[PDB]
Amino acid sequence: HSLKPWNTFGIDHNAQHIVCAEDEQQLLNAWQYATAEGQPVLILGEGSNVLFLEDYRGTVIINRIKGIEIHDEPDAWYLHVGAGENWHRLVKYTLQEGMPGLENLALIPGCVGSSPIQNIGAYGVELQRVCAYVDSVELATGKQVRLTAKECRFGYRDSIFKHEYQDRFAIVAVGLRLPKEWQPVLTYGDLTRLDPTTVTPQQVFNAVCHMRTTKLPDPKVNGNAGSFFKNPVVSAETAKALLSQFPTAPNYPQADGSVKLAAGWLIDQCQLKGMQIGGAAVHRQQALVLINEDNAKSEDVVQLAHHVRQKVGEKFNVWLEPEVRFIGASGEVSAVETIS
Ligand SMILES: Cc1cc2nc3c(=O)[nH]c(=O)nc-3n(C[C@H](O)[C@H](O)[C@H](O)COP(=O)(O)OP(=O)(O)OC[C@H]3O[C@@H](n4cnc5c(N)ncnc54)[C@H](O)[C@@H]3O)c2cc1C
Ligand SMILES: CCC(O[C@H]1[C@H](O)[C@@H](CO)O[C@H](OP(=O)(O)OP(=O)(O)OC[C@H]2O[C@@H](n3ccc(=O)[nH]c3=O)[C@H](O)[C@@H]2O)[C@@H]1NC(C)=O)C(=O)O
């Protein structure tokens, strides 16, 4: 069975079984069944962060556990959201319902269960800010677990679910804490033009969606998995050196002296916008996004990434690391290794 509907990149590879789990017991059943048949199991929300490299030897579970629960506290609305829930429709609903605090993370694809995994962030906010806890099933034992946001170990596009807990657990629900006292995050890009007291949550939603819509490709049109590489963090010295010859480089300094750079700027600086390898290209309005321009095979996407990464590594000696998850036949492989 074909994985192509199940991943936003539009990559056509195959799995032994693909299965929609619409409740927790169901998911657990499908996992127990495939691992009892010696098969690997892959859980997916919408497949918007995965690149299939090969045909997959096991079972792919599509997490579709839905439902929202809202618990009132004097300080905050607490939401208990099913993993199979679509994140942008949750952002829309929460705002429609008078519970703001998710608008900066508007239009990010995927399911709510997947949002802790890579600490979803855009426009000044990461999921860690409104995340209370995450609920999982210990797939290997049925044991139901709850982690606090602290125990989640949130990082820039990181969490415990990319390490200790990865294939051991399946997320079934995420707990969100939205403060009743709304507080607008207007620190990023065109949001700094909005005033903190006149602005409604819906104008931030619109302001964010407009920046997104102007630069980012629709997977409906051309398949992609968003920002293919992470923004590089370099040493204080190396950032100063690159910024000596390249003064206008977007850079985001840390307290601890090190500097984050813009990976999309560095790719752009190598004149790779519009560059193609087979059906895969570097998107012209945002060079950090690789796309499925025409019936792209997974090897084309891997080669374009190897090409873009070598070019930036030769020009800037900054070596780019992918944010997309590389899935090979028996489970996830190392993406940098595959594009080296
Ligand atoms: C157009 C576009 C724009 C994007 N914009 C952003 C952005 O602004 N900011 C940002 O941070 N990201 C962004 N992304 C990346 C993407 O939306 C995130 O990585 C998102 O969290 C993935 O959601 P998903 O449900 O599609 O995960 P999937 O791709 O289905 O899975 C992701 C990984 O997590 C695992 N996982 C998925 N569901 C579960 C579960 N229930 N239990 C255990 N593991 C699970 C999978 O096995 C896999 O390793 C964008 C992507 C696209 C296509
Ligand atoms: C699809 C988006 C996405 O996540 C993205 C998020 O929405 C966005 C806003 O907060 O910031 C990241 O992109 P990015 O850092 O490129 O955001 P941008 O504001 O577009 O640009 C940063 C700097 O790069 C420059 N830039 C970017 C692309 C380009 O082709 N040319 C260029 O000059 C910009 O002008 C800017 O000064 C996210 N990425 C990471 C890896 O941290 C994802 O993870 O999938």
Curated annotation (Swiss-Prot):
Pathway in which this enzyme or protein is active: Cell wall biogenesis; peptidoglycan biosynthesis
Compartment(s): Cytoplasm
Family: Belongs to the MurB family.
Phylogenetic classification of the source organism: Bacteria, Pseudomonadati, Pseudomonadota, Gammaproteobacteria, Enterobacterales
Cofactor(s) it depends on: FAD
Protein name as annotated: UDP-N-acetylenolpyruvoylglucosamine reductase
Cross-referenced HAMAP family: MurB (MF_00037)
Domain (FAD-binding PCMH-type) ranges: 11-181
Enzyme class: oxidoreductase
One Gene Ontology CC term in the entry: cytosol
Gene Ontology MF annotations: FAD binding; flavin adenine dinucleotide binding; UDP-N-acetylmuramate dehydrogenase activity
Residues noted as binding substrate in the record, renumbered to the chain: Y188
Highest taxon of source: Bacteria
Species of origin: Escherichia coli (strain K12)
Active site feature: R157, S227, E323
Reaction(s) this enzyme catalyzes, per UniProt: UDP-N-acetyl-alpha-D-muramate + NADP(+) = UDP-N-acetyl-3-O-(1-carboxyvinyl)-alpha-D-glucosamine + NADPH + H(+)
